[PDB]
Design a protein around this nucleic acid. Sequence first.
RNA 1: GCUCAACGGAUAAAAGGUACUCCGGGGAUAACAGGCUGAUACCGCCCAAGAGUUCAUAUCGACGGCGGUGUUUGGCACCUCGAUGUCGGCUCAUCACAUCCUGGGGCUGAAGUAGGUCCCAAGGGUAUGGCUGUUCGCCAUUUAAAGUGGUACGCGAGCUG
RNA 2: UCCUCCUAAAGAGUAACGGAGGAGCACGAAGGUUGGCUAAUCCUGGUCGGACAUCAGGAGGUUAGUGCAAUGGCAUAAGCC
RNA 3: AGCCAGGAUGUUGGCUUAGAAGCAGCCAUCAUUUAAAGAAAGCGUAAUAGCUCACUGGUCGAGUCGGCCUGCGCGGAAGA
RNA 4: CCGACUUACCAACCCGAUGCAAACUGCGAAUACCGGAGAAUGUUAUCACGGGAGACACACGGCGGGUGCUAACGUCCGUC
Lengths: 84, 136, 136, 38, 94
Amino acid sequence: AHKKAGGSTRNGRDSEAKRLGVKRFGGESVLAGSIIVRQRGTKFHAGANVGCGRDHTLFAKADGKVKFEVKGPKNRKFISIEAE
Amino acid sequence: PLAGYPVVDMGIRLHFGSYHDVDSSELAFKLAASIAFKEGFKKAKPVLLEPIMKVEVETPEENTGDVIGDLSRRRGMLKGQESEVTGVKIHAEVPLSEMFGYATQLRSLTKGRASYTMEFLKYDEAPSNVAQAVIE
Amino acid sequence: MLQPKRTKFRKMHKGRNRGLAQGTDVSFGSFGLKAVGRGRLTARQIEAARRAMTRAVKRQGKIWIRVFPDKPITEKPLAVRMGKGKGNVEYWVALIQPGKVLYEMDGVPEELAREAFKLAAAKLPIKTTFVTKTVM
Amino acid sequence: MKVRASVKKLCRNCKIVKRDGVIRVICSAEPKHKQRQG
Amino acid sequence: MFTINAEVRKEQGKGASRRLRAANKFPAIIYGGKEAPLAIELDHDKVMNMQAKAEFYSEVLTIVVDGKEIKVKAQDVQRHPYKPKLQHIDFVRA
RNA sequence: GCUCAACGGAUAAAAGGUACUCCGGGGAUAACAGGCUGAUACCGCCCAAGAGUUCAUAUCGACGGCGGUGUUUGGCACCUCGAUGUCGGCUCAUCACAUCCUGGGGCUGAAGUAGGUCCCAAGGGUAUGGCUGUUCGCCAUUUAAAGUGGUACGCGAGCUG
RNA sequence: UCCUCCUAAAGAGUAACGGAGGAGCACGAAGGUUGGCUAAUCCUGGUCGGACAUCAGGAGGUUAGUGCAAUGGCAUAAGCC
RNA sequence: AGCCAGGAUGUUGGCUUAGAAGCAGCCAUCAUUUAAAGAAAGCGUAAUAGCUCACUGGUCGAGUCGGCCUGCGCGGAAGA
RNA sequence: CCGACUUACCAACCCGAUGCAAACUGCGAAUACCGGAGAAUGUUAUCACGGGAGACACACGGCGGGUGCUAACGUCCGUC
Ligand SMILES: [Mg+2]
Ligand SMILES: [Mg+2]
Ligand SMILES: [Mg+2]
Ligand SMILES: [Mg+2]
Ligand SMILES: [Mg+2]
Ligand SMILES: [Mg+2]
Ligand SMILES: [Mg+2]
Ligand SMILES: [Mg+2]
Ligand SMILES: [Mg+2]
Ligand SMILES: [Mg+2]
Ligand SMILES: [Mg+2]
Ligand SMILES: [Mg+2]
Ligand SMILES: [Mg+2]
Ligand SMILES: [Mg+2]
Ligand SMILES: [Mg+2]
Ligand SMILES: [Mg+2]
Ligand SMILES: [Mg+2]
Ligand SMILES: [Mg+2]
Ligand SMILES: [Mg+2]
Ligand SMILES: [Mg+2]
Ligand SMILES: [Mg+2]
Ligand SMILES: [Mg+2]
Ligand SMILES: [Mg+2]
Ligand SMILES: [Mg+2]
Ligand SMILES: [Mg+2]
Ligand SMILES: [Mg+2]
Ligand SMILES: [Mg+2]
Ligand SMILES: [Mg+2]
Ligand SMILES: [Zn+2]
């Protein structure tokens, strides 16, 4: 014909971005309950004064200053808080 | 079967056969023999044979090269050279199919001072190109 | 026709051909063909060069292909408009950076290897040069 | 004369000579080696 | 047996090394033993003809810096990817 | 209690034709032409396995590579939808040269006749009909030859339809 | 409409009729807690029995497993009883 | 460079081939007199023959040859 | 009754040497971003609330890419 009709793709789908990542970095002063990192799995583990939610959201269990550190035999990344 | 030609140099010997007590008939076996020929011939992938014939050409000494070239050009493999006093005598099995009009061509290369005597030699396998041409 | 036997995915982004090469030394044979320019070598290009290069040395020595076509290239058919998904994979290519050794050769004299690589480089779109093995 | 872009010696009797700004291959032996760049 | 006249580098880095190679010298280092490593620059072409020998990479070389002798070995060589040039040379003392 | 899945869900409840058409708009958006591009196409060149009795390069030329032109099929949607009339024919042309004839030349597997293939050359010249709306094409018979392409696939305020 | 990866240029987000896959559930245990336990694969030997069933030892160390895609995570197991 | 002269004896090396006589193609590529000479680089022959080259002695009497890198040029390069 | 060898065959795993990757990572920048402190500069350049809008057709160029032919004054994003 004058023009050749094309096909169709089968890859159009994608899901919404979940806004994961670190919310407060090292040195941030946070209130109790502040979300530090939103995660899939425990890439960062909960240290002192830090709690882990059902979806592994790390949140502050006290007022203070955020600190990242590496601890344990496995060199895992822990998030703790110095109470200030 | 391949191209409607009289098959030659074929050797067949009958060893096994079956017949029906009341239906045994000479015509049946005759037709059955033809059937057997068909399958056997196909699997043997036959090759057409051309009438390769020996050719003897006499020519002046100075034109020996011209003669050799033409003989070779016509897919003919030479088998002998005779250094006769009055010119050289050459021999070759030029394919008959290829050799047509050779007399006229030969004269120009030998200043019209040569001649040839033809005698059929043997039917040989045709080259792929030539064989296919005849098949089609 | 060099081509991966299977691939994790059948199509790949266009990408960019930046940087210098890895594998700039004659590591296997004694002589080598080294790419001076950058570009794409199709499997047909690599294989055509290999035929000339292996045939040049009269099937002597040993021949090493140092490059592999692992990048699939898609082409939209003639007279189709833009969009309607990505095109179909037509051929494979290897990306070539300046300095990469494409072919290696051993077991043959240097003057013959030089001539063989000349015929082989006549088939390649990218500028080449002749290199030999060195002790580091 | 063969006019091509890649002129070169096809035997030892071939000579490369530049005449009037064009490269030429002239052979004293046989004239099928006569070439002109162009 | 090879005598290499080399002068210690005044400045180092990517810009300095590229400037040096444009001026037809190339950087090299001498490390080993207990003395601190010494960064030298030296003429490209002289060493390029010298290293065309196969015995250059095995036998003991001589490097002259500030009129003082250092006995070294050609530990490694970094060559240009396609041009016949030397980017850098690693030398080991003794 | 909703494949209200057209998933921020028009109504509880709804498919088509229009060449008989009509209005408001858009070159925001297609068909012709121009434009950009040049995959494809055409032309040229690079390397030579081989064909050419022998002999790669007289003549061709595999597997591959690099360009040119704008010239086919395309890609895009930049211009025109308060209109740029769209094929073929007729009349009248004009340019480019990648030359069909005539002119000059090199090589030839150029004995002569007659060719083949490149290089130079655009001064002039370069069919009539049968059949189809045809351009083409096939065919008949000529000719030294019945060139290729651009000019809005030249030319409808010049004709035809 | 929703989920996972890439495009996405090391915070978030980021388009195309871009490249690939899934969901419209399941489970009163497959949830809570306490206690306990640790794979894939291969080698050697061993009734049917063999490449490959159950058994013993060894190597190996998560190359397994996760009710279902993909990514991240998981031994203090989030895996098994 | 050029010019003069030689470029010779096993030998037509063997195999193959209608022929393969240095020179279609295969293996070998050795000996000899040498100042030198190849079981031959090329032209030629149907095979020979023949013609050069490598190499050598003389003549001349001062520089010459071939690659590598690199600057700027040259051809490839035809439109209304 | 369980055996012991062997050859120019195929040969997995493993070792050594080589490359390739948007949907590979035992490594890993420059930048960008978040926060704390300090000076200088800046007509508050910042935030909040309220009155009024317009606008939601973008274009090219640089840089990082997808798509296309690393074709297009093509198309789709990021950033200036
Ligand atoms: Mg898919
Ligand atoms: Mg810099
Ligand atoms: Mg809707
Ligand atoms: Mg909606
Ligand atoms: Mg209207
Ligand atoms: Mg209107
Ligand atoms: Mg428009
Ligand atoms: Mg148009
Ligand atoms: Mg647009
Ligand atoms: Mg217009
Ligand atoms: Mg309009
Ligand atoms: Mg108007
Ligand atoms: Mg012309
Ligand atoms: Mg005149
Ligand atoms: Mg008429
Ligand atoms: Mg015209
Ligand atoms: Mg028109
Ligand atoms: Mg008009
Ligand atoms: Mg009118
Ligand atoms: Mg009128
Ligand atoms: Mg991001
Ligand atoms: Mg970023
Ligand atoms: Mg001969
Ligand atoms: Mg040029
Ligand atoms: Mg809008
Ligand atoms: Mg918009
Ligand atoms: Mg935009
Ligand atoms: Mg645009
Ligand atoms: Zn010549």
